[PDB]
């Protein structure tokens, strides 16, 4: 940015007394420096900085998922200690008998 | 029937999860990336068709005086400006969108 408005201290001052469109060249010249050094970069270097920061959310929500997997598992663990709890009463029960 | 209840909130969380992800087959954040990108790859292409217009339109009222195809060694350097700057590099954007 400081490259090109150090240019453009020198070439828009000449720009600024020319009638014309495109073929006044010079002014073009300026308005494509701007375009592409400042505008496309920057709308480039946001895009990249935000797919990482969505690449990194991806990346959370497969954990997401899998602690979720993991925590289903112990909560059907714990039903099935239960379960088993009961069979073992009945076990001692058929002691009895 | 409690540990198959269990189960099946396990079942339900990922049916949950990806049925979720599969909705946002883009997220918010990435589609502001596209957005950005596309935005920056179109100015890029703004500047290099613009550049380029300049240095054809340049070349054009002489190539045209001489006999030859590239042979006018003018003829050629609108092609291998316009083709190597422009060409080639809208065919990549668009195989990268």
Same mark, same amino acid.
């Given at each position: 940015?400081?490259?090109?408005?150090?240019?453009?201290?020198?070439? *828009?001052?000449?720009?600024?007394?020319?009638?014309?469109?495109?073929?006044?060249?010079?002014?073009?010249?300026?308005?494509?420096?701007? *375009?592409?050094?400042?505008?496309?970069? *920057?709308?480039?270097?946001?895009?990249?900085?935000?797919?990482?920061?969505?690449?990194?959310?991806?990346?959370?929500?497969?954990?997401?998922?899998?602690?979720?997997?993991?925590?289903?598992?112990?909560?059907?663990?714990?039903?099935?200690?239960?379960?088993?709890?009961?069979?073992?009463?009945?076990? *001692?029960?058929?002691?009895?008998? | %029937?409690? !540990?198959?209840? %269990?189960? %099946?909130?396990?079942?339900?969380?990922?049916?949950?999860?990806?049925? %979720?992800?599969?909705?946002?087959?883009?997220?918010?954040?990435?589609?502001?990336?596209?957005?950005?990108?596309?935005?920056?790859?179109?100015?890029?292409?703004?500047?290099?068709?613009?550049?380029?217009?300049?240095?054809?339109?340049?070349?054009?009222?002489?190539?045209?005086?001489?006999?030859?195809?590239?042979?006018?060694?003018?003829?050629?350097?609108?092609?291998?400006?316009? !083709?190597?700057?422009?060409?080639?590099?809208?065919?990549?954007?668009?195989?990268?969108?």
């Amino acid at each position: 940015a400081s490259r090109l408005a150090g240019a453009a201290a020198d070439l *828009v001052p000449n720009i600024f007394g020319f009638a014309g469109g495109g073929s006044r060249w010079g002014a073009i010249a300026e308005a494509t420096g701007y *375009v592409m050094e400042f505008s496309a970069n *920057v709308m480039n270097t946001e895009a990249d900085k935000i797919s990482q920061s969505e690449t990194y959310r991806r990346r959370r929500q497969e954990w997401e998922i899998q602690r979720n997997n993991a925590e289903a598992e112990l909560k059907q663990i714990d039903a099935q200690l239960k379960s088993l709890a009961v069979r073992r009463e009945a076990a *001692v029960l058929q002691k009895t008998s | %029937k409690t !540990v198959l209840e %269990k189960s %099946k909130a396990g079942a339900q969380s990922r049916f949950d999860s990806y049925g %979720k992800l599969y909705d946002e087959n883009i997220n918010a954040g990435e589609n502001q990336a596209m957005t950005l990108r596309a935005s920056a790859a179109g100015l890029t292409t703004a500047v290099q068709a613009s550049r380029l217009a300049g240095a054809a339109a340049d070349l054009v009222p002489n190539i045209f005086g001489f006999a030859g195809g590239g042979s006018r060694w003018g003829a050629i350097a609108e092609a291998t400006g316009y !083709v190597m700057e422009f060409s080639a590099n809208v065919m990549n954007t668009e195989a990268d969108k």
